[PDB]
Amino acid sequence: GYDRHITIFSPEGRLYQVEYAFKATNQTNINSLAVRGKDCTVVISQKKVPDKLLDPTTVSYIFCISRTIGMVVNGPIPDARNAALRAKAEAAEFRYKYGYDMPCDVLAKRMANLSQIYTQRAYMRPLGVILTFVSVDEELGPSIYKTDPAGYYVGYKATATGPKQQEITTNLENHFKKSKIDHINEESWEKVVEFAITHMIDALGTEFSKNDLEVGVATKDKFFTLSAENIEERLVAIAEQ
């Protein structure tokens, strides 16, 4: 039974190492969510600092890949940072060679191709991570593209990742079934972040303080993360209506 140790086919045409890499994805016990506005793309993720000895400012699963592209990761931090470093290198090289900023969907494809190689080549293991890339693309507008250990990727109107992804997914599905549009019809990114946090609270059934969340926002020509005090202002506005 060595067909379960390396990435070769089992008698059912399955790759067990790829399937087990998907299971490692939920080892951190963190849920993330991404949505699109008119002018922006917002990504939120749970933040858990279980040890008091930790410096909470260094605990993060959101990465600034390029000026325009942001990436949130679902999976262990070593594999997350591995993927982060590579994505940063790929984005920089792309700009140097082709003279324009690497699009979000193109980076997603590139990282997905790299993941595909690990499923075919035996000496390399899959990374136990799911990568959600966000930006406001200059051609396609607000964009969410998500990659997994199988080498699969696709665009999203909105998406969710983690142990409780299904609850969040169905919550988002129901909202877009009502509105009948592919985005959050809102002018400011502040209100789109408020939408994201509200619908995560509804889906998970839990309340959040300023230190329980982690937020990333993509606008035209920049991606940035919010501070604890920026999130607090967001939480106050939610509670006041």
Partner: protein, 250 residues
Amino acid sequence: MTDRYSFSLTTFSPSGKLGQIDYALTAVKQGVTSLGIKATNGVVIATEKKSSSPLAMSETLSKVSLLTPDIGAVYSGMGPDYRVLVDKSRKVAHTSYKRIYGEYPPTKLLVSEVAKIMQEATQSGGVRPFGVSLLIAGHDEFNGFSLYQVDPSGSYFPWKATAIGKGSVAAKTFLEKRWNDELELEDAIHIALLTLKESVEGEFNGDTIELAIIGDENPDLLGYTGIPTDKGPRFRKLTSQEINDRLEAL
């Protein structure tokens, strides 16, 4: 480090079976149904856009891909394996042909190059076979219209019409009754839609079906005028609306 898997991971078993190739074919069998039909004045290839989530934008996932202006491809099996093969197939069409002869390769030879890549993943060190079967449709001046199937082993066969994946056995029987050598392209599209409806459970419309043709030259899709001999690509992907129009006359 270094890749220390320099040995074959696909080997003959006592019964003469190449296990990994057989298992790759099993993966293809689980895959979503795709088909191809050849007409007198064109070829059609079609498949179902099995969306993994309704939040996913299935237009951003292309199951039918342009390889050259006159050659297209569709698959059944593992999507990621297909995507990288399309990248390699597009590049090899240039490096091993267009940069030498100043023209795009004929269908049979591009198929031959894709097959070679798939064969090598069946013998080279430290790799598994590709878990896909391809259907490649195309046209060239001297061979006319053609349709080819390529398997994980690297073997390829020309077809008048065929199907691969989930419901291929039933689909091939359906095609045998309907196919003749006097079909026009519109007739072949009609038969393709009829055949594909049998293997689809849920929604059946332009948004859940991906369909492309190899037909007449499209000067409107060339992007420039002024060179008489350049008349445009024969590959054309049908729009969501164009599919729905033909579903009313179904």
